[PDB]
Amino acid sequence: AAVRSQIEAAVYKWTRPRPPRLGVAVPRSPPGTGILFHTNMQTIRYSLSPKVWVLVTGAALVGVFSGQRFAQTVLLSKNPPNPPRYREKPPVRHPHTPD
Amino acid sequence: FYILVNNNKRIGIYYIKLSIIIGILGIVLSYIIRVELYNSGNRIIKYDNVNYYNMVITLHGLLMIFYIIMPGLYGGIPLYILPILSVITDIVLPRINNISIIIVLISYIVVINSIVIEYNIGTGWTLYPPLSIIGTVIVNMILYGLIIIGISSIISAINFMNILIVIDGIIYVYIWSIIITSVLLIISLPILNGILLMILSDIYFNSIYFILNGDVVLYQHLFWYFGHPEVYILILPAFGIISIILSVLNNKIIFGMKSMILAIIMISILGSIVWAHHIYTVGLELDTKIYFNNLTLIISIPTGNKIYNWIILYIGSYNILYNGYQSLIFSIMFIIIFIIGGITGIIISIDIIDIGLHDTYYIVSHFHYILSIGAVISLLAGILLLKDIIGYYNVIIKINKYFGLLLFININIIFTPQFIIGFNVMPRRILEYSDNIIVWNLISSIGSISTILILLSIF
Amino acid sequence: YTPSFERGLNPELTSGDYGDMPKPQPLIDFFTQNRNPWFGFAMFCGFNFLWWAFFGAWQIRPLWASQRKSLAEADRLYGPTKYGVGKKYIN
Amino acid sequence: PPTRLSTPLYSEGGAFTVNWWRNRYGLYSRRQTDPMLAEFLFRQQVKEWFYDVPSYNYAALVGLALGILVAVIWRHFLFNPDVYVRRQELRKMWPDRHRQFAYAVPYLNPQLKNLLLPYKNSFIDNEPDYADYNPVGLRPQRVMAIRRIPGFFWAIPQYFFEDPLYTSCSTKNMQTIYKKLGYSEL
Amino acid sequence: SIFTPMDWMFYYFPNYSRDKVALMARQIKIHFAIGFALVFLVYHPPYKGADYGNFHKSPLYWYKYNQLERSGQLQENLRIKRDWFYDEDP
Amino acid sequence: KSYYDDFKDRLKPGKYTQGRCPQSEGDYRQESKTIGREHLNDDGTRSKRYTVKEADALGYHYHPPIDKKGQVYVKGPNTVIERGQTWIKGYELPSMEYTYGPKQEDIPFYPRVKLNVWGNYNLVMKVEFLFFYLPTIIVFGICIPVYTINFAQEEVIYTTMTVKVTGRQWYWVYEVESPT
Amino acid sequence: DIPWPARTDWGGHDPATPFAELMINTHSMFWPVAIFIYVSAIYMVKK
Amino acid sequence: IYEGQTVQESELIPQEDDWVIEETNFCLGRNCYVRFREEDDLARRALHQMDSQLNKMHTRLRDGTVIPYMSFHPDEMVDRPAPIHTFSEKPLLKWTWDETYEEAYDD
Amino acid sequence: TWTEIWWEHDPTPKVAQYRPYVCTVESGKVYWWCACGESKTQPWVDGHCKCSKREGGFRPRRWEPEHDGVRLFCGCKSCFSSPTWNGGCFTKWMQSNPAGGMLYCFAAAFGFGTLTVYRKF
Numbered sequence A: 001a002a003v004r005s006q007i008e009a010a011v012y013k014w015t016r017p018r019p020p021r022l023g024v025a026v027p028r029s030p031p032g033t034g035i036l037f038h039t040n041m042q043t044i045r046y047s048l049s050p051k052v053w054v055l056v057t058g059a060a061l062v063g064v065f066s067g068q069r070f071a072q073t074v075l076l077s078k079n080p081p082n083p084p085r086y087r088e089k090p091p092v093r094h095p096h097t098p099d
Numbered sequence B: 001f002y003i004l005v006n007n008n009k010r011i012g013i014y015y016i017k018l019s020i021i022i023g024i025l026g027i028v029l030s031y032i033i034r035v036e037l038y039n040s041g042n043r044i045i046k047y048d049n050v051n052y053y054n055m056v057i058t059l060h061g062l063l064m065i066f067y068i069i070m071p072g073l074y075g076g077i078p079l080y081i082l083p084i085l086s087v088i089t090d091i092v093l094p095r096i097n098n099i100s101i102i103i104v105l106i107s108y109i110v111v112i113n114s115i116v117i118e119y120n121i122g123t124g125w126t127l128y129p130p131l132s133i134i135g136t137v138i139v140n141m142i143l144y145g146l147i148i149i150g151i152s153s154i155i156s157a158i159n160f161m162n163i164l165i166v167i168d169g170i171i172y173v174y175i176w177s178i179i180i181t182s183v184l185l186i187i188s189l190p191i192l193n194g195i196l197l198m199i200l201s202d203i204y205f206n207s208i209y210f211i212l213n214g215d216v217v218l219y220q221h222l223f224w225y226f227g228h229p230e231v232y233i234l235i236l237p238a239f240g241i242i243s244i245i246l247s248v249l250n251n252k253i254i255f256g257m258k259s260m261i262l263a264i265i266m267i268s269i270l271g272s273i274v275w276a277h278h279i280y281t282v283g284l285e286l287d288t289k290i291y292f293n294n295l296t297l298i299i300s301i302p303t304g305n306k307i308y309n310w311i312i313l314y315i316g317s318y319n320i321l322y323n324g325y326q327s328l329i330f331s332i333m334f335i336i337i338f339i340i341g342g343i344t345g346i347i348i349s350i351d352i353i354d355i356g357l358h359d360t361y362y363i364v365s366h367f368h369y370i371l372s373i374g375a376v377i378s379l380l381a382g383i384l385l386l387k388d389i390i391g392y393y394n395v396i397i398k399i400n401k402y403f404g405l406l407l408f409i410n411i412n413i414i415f416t417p418q419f420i421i422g423f424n425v426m427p428r429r430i431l432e433y434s435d436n437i438i439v440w441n442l443i444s445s446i447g448s449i450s451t452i453l454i455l456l457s458i459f
Numbered sequence C: 001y002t003p004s005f006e007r008g009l010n011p012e013l014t015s016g017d018y019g020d021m022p023k024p025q026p027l028i029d030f031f032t033q034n035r036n037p038w039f040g041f042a043m044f045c046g047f048n049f050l051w052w053a054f055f056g057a058w059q060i061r062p063l064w065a066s067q068r069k070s071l072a073e074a075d076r077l078y079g080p081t082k083y084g085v086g087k088k089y090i091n
Numbered sequence D: 001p002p003t004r005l006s007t008p009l010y011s012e013g014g015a016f017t018v019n020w021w022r023n024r025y026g027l028y029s030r031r032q033t034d035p036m037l038a039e040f041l042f043r044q045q046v047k048e049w050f051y052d053v054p055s056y057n058y059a060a061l062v063g064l065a066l067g068i069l070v071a072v073i074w075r076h077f078l079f080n081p082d083v084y085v086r087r088q089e090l091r092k093m094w095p096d097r098h099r100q101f102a103y104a105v106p107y108l109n110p111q112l113k114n115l116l117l118p119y120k121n122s123f124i125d126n127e128p129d130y131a132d133y134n135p136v137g138l139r140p141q142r143v144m145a146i147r148r149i150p151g152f153f154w155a156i157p158q159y160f161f162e163d164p165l166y167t168s169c170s171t172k173n174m175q176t177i178y179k180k181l182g183y184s185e186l
Numbered sequence E: 001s002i003f004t005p006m007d008w009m010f011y012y013f014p015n016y017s018r019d020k021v022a023l024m025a026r027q028i029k030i031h032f033a034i035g036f037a038l039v040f041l042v043y044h045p046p047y048k049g050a051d052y053g054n055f056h057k058s059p060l061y062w063y064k065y066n067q068l069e070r071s072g073q074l075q076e077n078l079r080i081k082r083d084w085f086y087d088e089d090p
Numbered sequence F: 001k002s003y004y005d006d007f008k009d010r011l012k013p014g015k016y017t018q019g020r021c022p023q024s025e026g027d028y029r030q031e032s033k034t035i036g037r038e039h040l041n042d043d044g045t046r047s048k049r050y051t052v053k054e055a056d057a058l059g060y061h062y063h064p065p066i067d068k069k070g071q072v073y074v075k076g077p078n079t080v081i082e083r084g085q086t087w088i089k090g091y092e093l094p095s096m097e098y099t100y101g102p103k104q105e106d107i108p109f110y111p112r113v114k115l116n117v118w119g120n121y122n123l124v125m126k127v128e129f130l131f132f133y134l135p136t137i138i139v140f141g142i143c144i145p146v147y148t149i150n151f152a153q154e155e156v157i158y159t160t161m162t163v164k165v166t167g168r169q170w171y172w173v174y175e176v177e178s179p180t
Numbered sequence G: 001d002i003p004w005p006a007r008t009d010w011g012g013h014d015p016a017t018p019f020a021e022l023m024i025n026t027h028s029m030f031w032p033v034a035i036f037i038y039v040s041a042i043y044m045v046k047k
Numbered sequence H: 001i002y003e004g005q006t007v008q009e010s011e012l013i014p015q016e017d018d019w020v021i022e023e024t025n026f027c028l029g030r031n032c033y034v035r036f037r038e039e040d041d042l043a044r045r046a047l048h049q050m051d052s053q054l055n056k057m058h059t060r061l062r063d064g065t066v067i068p069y070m071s072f073h074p075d076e077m078v079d080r081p082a083p084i085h086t087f088s089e090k091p092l093l094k095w096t097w098d099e100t101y102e103e104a105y106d107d
Numbered sequence I: 001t002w003t004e005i006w007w008e009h010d011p012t013p014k015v016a017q018y019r020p021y022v023c024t025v026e027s028g029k030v031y032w033w034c035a036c037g038e039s040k041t042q043p044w045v046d047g048h049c050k051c052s053k054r055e056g057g058f059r060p061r062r063w064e065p066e067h068d069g070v071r072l073f074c075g076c077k078s079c080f081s082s083p084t085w086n087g088g089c090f091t092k093w094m095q096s097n098p099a100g101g102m103l104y105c106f107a108a109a110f111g112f113g114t115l116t117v118y119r120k121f
């Protein structure tokens, strides 16, 4: 539990997002400007920060392929060698051959 | 008056009304086909009346293509909104617009009368010779209907092209969709007329084009030189509708408008040069096959760009707006369904895959997913969007989640199994089949009866 | 069905007086829709179709039992030889 | 893209330039009724269609498709032994059409056919070399490729030397097996 | 420009892109010539491309070949596993 | 609350199927005799005489609307002079309760918001490039396979036997070389 | 050889010629690409 | 691509410290099928329909200007259902430019 | 992260719970949802939180069900489909505890991988 909190606090500190490098030409907000809008505005989707998104998405990818390996090695089985192919007698006549 | 009216909006209503009427005959024929195919044996058609089945499949195809979906997506919605989208008082050619709808009705009456009076035989909706030219008079009557329909299509195309001369606003994507379909008609129809005249010459004028030393494969070239442009003349208006619905309902400006427009232009040019993918099994030269296969796969590029531009239109839209409206659901369903139909089209485009899958029910399911599902739903979605403007009532469709769900589920029950039997394999244009294909045929048949029942709940 | 009052992760934020407003409930209620018998029938209905969609109805099996025992005997006695687990399948 | 009509637009010289396009854009236009309005509408169209980055992708696709199309047409006329435009050979019976028979073998052996036929072993598991040998000599003898076709062939190993069963599935080992039984010659 | 984002072409080659109409024409012409050349220089050339003794063997081919050669896998892979049809019944 | 109860009074249930009595009880097909209603039927629908038999577009009841001075009646705006300025008061549509019925109260709040636009030009351009060229790559990935399989079907093989197959209505004829 | 009941046979079944094997493998080769095209596009059909 | 109108920081500076974003409801109201009175005849039901047009509605802001019902396409600008003759006065598409001429001004 | 790093002029809620609230709702009744996370009658406004007092841009969120039933409601106060839940509560939790988020995502992906591989194989 001590190690759990340690790694949890280590991940958290590293992932805290930095301000975005805006790829758009917007003004600077006037200084001292607080909340002007309200919560009835059309909801804006809550998006993970890039670092966090990579971490969880990477955990998902590592998870699905490790799950694929677990199924392949434990749940599934390999083909045993094919049965020996011995000479066998074919039927004497085709069932539809006129007599 | 009723028949004398020249109002472009009234004529648009007439086109939708007539498409539904003629559509009843189309759906009935489809029910006959699926009932027959429910098991092996004879179910509703006698073995001595197998010619009727051949006629049923032939008329089904011809009516649904030329008398229902084309009059509905290229005649109905276009004649009602195009002059409004163009901020013009009315259509450029008022009198021509009136005669076009009358022509469609008259050609329909000729076709159905030929069912009643002539001997019932069939040669497919593709009227391949020599079979088409050794038949009875019902084939002659069907040819007259097609030629008459061709007159209406070309004059309507001329009508829409004249909007460029009078448009007082901006050519929106939908307007571009109709204009390009009109161009495709002006260039493809004259070739169709010529080959149809040659079919008549052999039927009625003792010509010898389709007898030995004359190449029957010639017909297939000229027919499909119109055939495939036809499938895009039937889908492009649907694409135009989808663009309007997604932008309007999501309150989002079309993204990549110029790429949408240039994608429609590209599809048309490419669609005018890929026809021989319908003739892969005849025995064409290796280089021809490779050319056509290569160019056929290219059509996916412009078609793919449009699909992804639609997706981003729906992405990010406000959550507060109710998303259960039937028009929005149908528009979204079109993207989901069209991708299935197109991908299977790319599969059949590979000629070596096509050798196995030509003239099998895989081809059926492919073009049904695009037309019987995609085009129908697009026309429904477009009419539904214009319910207030059109003003019709006495139906429960606008907000009916049951209808959309039941339709989607049951339509897939009909045609998804037809992909399976394509590798079984069950040929097309047949009524009897081996007992080991009953399961899938039975499942699809159960789907057909169910879809019909859902059509009654709207009233 | 007189559902229970689930306080949640932060019980202090559910400690007020609800009055007429509904109180929070356990998640089993959401899955059972408050143990609505018709939703249970609908749930059983959903499974029934999905089973038909993927594997077939499997409701015909009791009726097909005798005709699946005849098919199995024919395949074993007269059909092409099956090897190993292949002998499990009869077509 | 300038926003003021006073600022001129740069044009190259030639048959497809900004000046060439201006001369012809308004030929059929009822809306370009005076210089100011004509220029405004002209720049509006140029801004919308020629300054749109994604539009250039379609320009590439039309050029590529059309170039292939023109060339395949030309190739048939110029080289295909079965396409006749001259009539000398069509005025003779088939056994006498020597000049047209000269196109046959060269046309039967295009470069890409020789380059890609060896890669049939990426589509066939058993005897991918069943049709390699031909004693006549109209076509070259075929040798199976050493690598899988680049792209979507992940189901087969990148190189066939990596595959354990490849050699035992060859038409040569199969011929050995069947010849040992007296079953068949091939 | 082939497989080129034209936004990049506009930024890095401003003078070559100044006339956007002419730029569009070159885009069409360049890709037209590419398609034409492919048919008559890659497909058409007769009696060419049949040098199967010159199959290109890339650096990755040799890396994987030498690795298997060093061990016995290459010999084992090439060995014919079965050259008889019927097993012997005891 | 139930908003239907607010305008229940306005909706009086009907008596006749399709809202008309049998023609015998009242002849709705005839033109109304009421003054000023000569263009309407008794039930209020437009009479066939007005719309078909004597339609003005066909030259019946010719009456040019425009006067000698090329003028037609036009209703003016509601003008209100005030504060040394002439103002026009616009016509506001009636309450939606009057036209639709529901009482206009407890309306959900939908705030003003400018159009939802995609930003970051550079990012958008790259996506559009991918929207076009990812499919192009896939097509190119199929091209080589397509050529190879086509070449494979059309391969000159050393065939040693020929079977001729003719298709007739409705059977298949087969011609095969007979052993010598 | 002959159709069998309730068989998907996705891409074909029971080849008896080298060309028949080629056809089956051509379909199998493209099938994962088709799934990718479908899944990747459908996943984004949402608000 | 369009990314909204450009804003200068000077234009974002309030004239009072209490200014917030105006909370005006842009939901036009509660509607349903247009409900005609039985007493009204064909002419008076036409007037009723013309008075129920959503595209004639607007929202008035705090300064007296009104934001109208707007649409991307002119299909939503005609009366619903569409009348026989719609655009008698040609709809005007307003384009903006920076050009000006002296005659329009006075000193 | 729109309120956290991109835009500083929208009200920022407090997370009441990183799990949805399950409630039975009735058609024809209007419910008011807390958008600040400080109400003591979650998920509803209690008349004493920021939303009730219209303080700091917080207002109650009107909601009305079409049919009767049990519906999930947002506790994180940031779900895109708020007041209803769509999974944003878990997403917002991962932002706040990225190490935990990875554990759950790995476990979910592991199960999905095993089942899909076991059935297809």
Ligand code: HEA
Pocket: B126, B231, B232, B234, B235, B277, B278, B296, B297, B299, B300, B301, B303, B304, B305, B307, B338, B339, B341, B342, B343, B345, B346, B348, B349, B350, B354, B357, B358, B359, B363, B367, B370, B371, F134, F135, F136, F138, F139, G037, G041
């Ligand atoms: C409107 C109807 C319509 C539409 C749009 C199409 C579209 C296409 N069709 Fe068509 N087709 C028909 C109707 C239609 N077809 C009919 C009715 C027949 C049978 C007529 C008869 O024989 O009697 C037929 C027959 C038919 C055949 C004949 C098979 C045979 O005879 O055995 C072929 C094969 O080439 C074919 C191919 C295609 C292709 C390659 C497309 C393309 O347009 C598909 C393009 C779409 C996509 C590819 C999906 C969307 C794009 C993406 C998702 C981008 C990513 C995808 C890739 C990169 C591949 N069609």
Ligand code: HEA
Pocket: B016, B019, B020, B023, B026, B027, B030, B031, B033, B034, B057, B058, B060, B061, B062, B064, B065, B068, B069, B072, B124, B125, B126, B364, B368, B371, B372, B373, B375, B376, B379, B380, B411, B414, B428, B429, B430, B431, B448, B451, B452
């Ligand atoms: C767009 C044209 C169209 C449409 C809608 C349909 C719809 C249907 N088709 Fe289609 N069909 C064809 C065109 C169409 N078909 C063609 C061209 C052929 C090949 C002909 C040939 O082989 O020669 C064919 C072949 C064909 C066969 C093959 C018979 C054979 O040759 O062996 C079968 C049965 O399996 C079938 C079944 C169905 C079914 C069950 C429906 C539908 O009933 C499914 C259910 C859907 C609905 C019932 C809704 C339809 C509603 C409308 C169309 C009206 C829309 C109007 C407005 C919205 C205003 N069709």
Ligand SMILES: CCCCCCCC/C=C/CCCCCCCC(=O)OC[C@H](COP(=O)(O)OCCN)OC(=O)CCCCCCC/C=C/CCCCCCCC
Pocket: D069, D070, D073, D074, D076, D077, D078, D079, D080, D081, D082, D083, D084, D085, D086, D087, D103
């Ligand atoms: C105006 C002054 C008077 C002019 C009088 C001209 C009279 C004759 C005109 C005849 C028609 C025009 C073509 C003339 C061709 C003359 C040379 C000639 O005989 O060419 C023969 C040669 C093949 O002859 P054979 O040896 O029989 O076949 C061998 C196996 N294939 O045929 C040709 O080259 C001519 C036919 C093709 C003409 C067009 C060129 C081919 C490509 C067409 C591409 C079409 C797509 C679009 C192209 C756009 C522009 C790039």
Ligand SMILES: [O-][O-]
Pocket: B227, B228, B231
């Ligand atoms: O036809 O595609």
Ligand SMILES: [Cu+2]
Pocket: B227, B228, B231, B274, B275, B277, B278
């Ligand atoms: Cu085609």
Ligand SMILES: [K+]
Pocket: B036, B037, B038, B039, B040, B041, B042, B043, B431, B432, B433
């Ligand atoms: K049958």
Ligand SMILES: [Zn+2]
Pocket: I034, I035, I036, I037, I038, I039, I045, I049, I050, I051, I052, I058
């Ligand atoms: Zn609150």
Ligand SMILES: [Zn+2]
Pocket: I074, I075, I076, I077, I078, I079, I085, I087, I088, I089, I090
């Ligand atoms: Zn939440």
